[PDB]
Paper text:
TbOPB was cocrystallised with the inhibitor antipain to investigate the structural features responsible for substrate recognition, specificity and catalysis. Electron density was visible for all active site residues and the covalently bound antipain inhibitor. The catalytic triad Asp648, His683, and Ser563, form the charge relay and Ser563 has reacted with the P1 aldehyde of antipain to form a covalent hemiacetal transition state analogue complex. The oxyanion is stabilized by hydrogen bonding to the NH group of Ala564, the residue that follows the catalytic Ser in the sequence, as is characteristic of α/β-hydrolase enzymes. The oxyanion is further stabilized by hydrogen bonding to the OH group of Tyr482, as observed for LmOPB and the related PREP and DPP4, but not AAP that instead has another hydrogen bond to a main chain NH. The primary specificity for a P1 Arg is provided by specific interactions with Glu607 and Glu655. The main chain carbonyl of Arg650 also contacts the guanidinium group of the P1 Arg, and additional specificity is provided by a π-stacking interaction with the side chain of Phe589. The P2 carbonyl is hydrogen bonded to the important Arg650, and this interaction is also conserved in PREP and AAP. In LmOPB the P3 Arg interacts with Ser523 and Leu617, whilst in TbOPB an alternative conformer was adopted, resulting in interactions with Asp214 and Lys208 of the propeller domain. The TbOPB-antipain closed state structure aligned with the equivalent LmOPB structure with a root mean square deviation (RMSD) of 0.59 Å for 588 CA atoms.
Oligopeptidase B (OPB, EC 3.4.21.83), an enzyme belonging to the prolyl oligopeptidase (PREP) family, has recently emerged as a virulence factor in T. brucei and other trypanosomes, and is a potential therapeutic target. OPB hydrolyses peptide substrates of up to 30 amino acid residues in length, after arginine or lysine with a preference for arginine and most efficiently after a pair of basic residues. The overall structure of TbOPB comprises the typical 2 domain α/β-hydrolase and β-propeller architecture that is present in all members of the PREP family structurally characterized to date. A short N-terminal segment (residues 1–87) and long C-terminal segment (residues 436–714) together form the α/β-hydrolase domain, whilst the region in between (residues 88–435) forms the β-propeller domain.
Residue numbers in the entry:
A (entry chain G): 1 to 4
B (entry chain A): 5 to 714
Amino acid sequence: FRVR
Amino acid sequence: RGPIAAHRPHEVVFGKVEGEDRGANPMDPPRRRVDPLFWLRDDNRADPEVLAHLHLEKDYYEKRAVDIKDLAETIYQEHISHIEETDMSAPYVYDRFLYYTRDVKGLSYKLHCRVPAGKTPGEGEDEEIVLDENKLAEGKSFCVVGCVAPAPPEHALVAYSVDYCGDEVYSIRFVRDVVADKVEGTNGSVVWGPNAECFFYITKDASKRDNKVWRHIIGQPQSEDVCLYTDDDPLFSVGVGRSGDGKTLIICSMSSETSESHLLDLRKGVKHNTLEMVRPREKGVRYTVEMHGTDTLIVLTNKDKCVNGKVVLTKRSAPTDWGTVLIPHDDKVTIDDVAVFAKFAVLSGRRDGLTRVWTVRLGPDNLFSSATLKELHFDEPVFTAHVVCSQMKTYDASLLRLRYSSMTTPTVWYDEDVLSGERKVVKARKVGGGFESKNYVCRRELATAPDGTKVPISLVYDTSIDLKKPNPTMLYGYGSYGICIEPEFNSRFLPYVDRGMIYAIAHVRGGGEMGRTWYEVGGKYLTKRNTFMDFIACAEHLISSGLTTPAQLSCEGRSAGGLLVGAVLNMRPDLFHVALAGVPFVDVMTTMCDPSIPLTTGEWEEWGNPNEYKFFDYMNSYSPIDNVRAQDYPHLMIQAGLHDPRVAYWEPAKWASKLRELKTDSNEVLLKMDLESGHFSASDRYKYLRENAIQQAFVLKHLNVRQLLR
């Protein structure tokens, strides 16, 4: 919270 | 051989494109190139030609996965016997209640239960089952709950959010339909106003960006909700939170290198909507805000070249005055964030490449006292700790909740008195299957990067393997975003270490293990190639120190770590015999140029933006798909998910077809596509474990190790  | 998709010519453009938004300063005239496999992208996930191609791949996969079905089975059971099927979590005070989660032995989803303040947590007469995820998941392929939010004081209304396909868009609903309100298209976060009168949520956007914060009032059609805050800047996402005392709401914007906050007064009720700017965004400046009562703002920030952070103290009324510094910036200490309570604050961060945690008290003056900083003591030299904030529900509290772990020690949660120092266990994790810590040891080597830099390696192995000869090893990597792969306990690796293998985490730059700079200078933008070269360095160290040889060495990455895998197989494929890449970010140029793919504009401030001269060539030199070439690669399994809102399904799909197309070796490249799940899934079940088992099976198969040491 928010990524690869 | 294997499936190879057909080439259909499509030009992809890099630079300026009328009508589209390719960033502040894009190339002109633009550059073009052919991507013969562009078609594999369908935004609607419905194309017949595509779905067909995925069948071919599903066929190939199943056809080639027959002879590990039986080992993956022996390994699922190990998993189960390590997992503890009937369980309770670590119960925490939230108001007039103790809250906790529960698992039951046949069942795939947690229960969310509640017990009144002064009673005893456990299945019983006192226990109200707030949500039963199994009843939610009833005859559905996919089911994830984002949030379970009861409404302050009472906890009569409880709201929750649910995604049914995994593209990570949520509806918000209420338990047992006590009320009829529904909220569609949200990020999942629910934050409450006072007295259950209303709450706050966050809608997605074009390309699934979190760009808006809204109020929802009970008794109303979503259509009547008031949007409080938009950020229109494609580089940013909006966040939202509640102050300790719950009288203040916190709205922010976060790009990768820049922040902004606002405040809203909840003491003035549902029709009061005017915000209070904190410090206007200034490029390069990041900062996070936490309230103490209604007036004092406690700001963690990187301003004035304080890269690892400094925590400042200011007033609501003069919120740009940051001359008062509570905790000053230290070169060797990173501060990742603060939590603030009535009587103190927890700082979470880093020193010596391990997680650390400090506490700060008020003085006799009733104002925060620099001189009261205490660093919290832990027993093992190499460990992992975080404060659990999702369990600190009480502003007046004196007990602070921590999760503590090491690659040797199964997890513990426990309370600790901020003042006294004393540590009671709340829950210690039990591991069956005859496991014991004393069978394992974990030490830290250091590899040498081509530029002299020392890259840390964390490793664990069964104490009884022979170290006087090479051993089969798995080397795992991340390391983007500033995210650190922790040396914490994880049962998931027991199947490897139980068979005489060495499990190993490469702490590459891009990570934040060694401080914020390990990421911002070391591994990002025009120094992103270190991620890959540091990794390669760790692996050469493993070989020349004699721990392993490449025929016995494997590697694993996921998401951005998939990127790491794909680059590293492009460069030094000879170092590995077998390789896992789950949900792998690999079609870098193509995705990164295009604003419509769900995470691209955020990450123009991570890898760079290839619509720009500054970044085109560099990214090209490591983009995995773009660097596939005629040479041997090792056995590789790729795991993808159809509704993956983070790494698009088509990405690994192309990379798998291109590998098979160009590769001159004859090892297997299998690609597992769960058409039911997203990014994180594989699944939200016992099927997660099933999925994970084939992965280990595939590797152990290729390593030629099957036999436990007990």
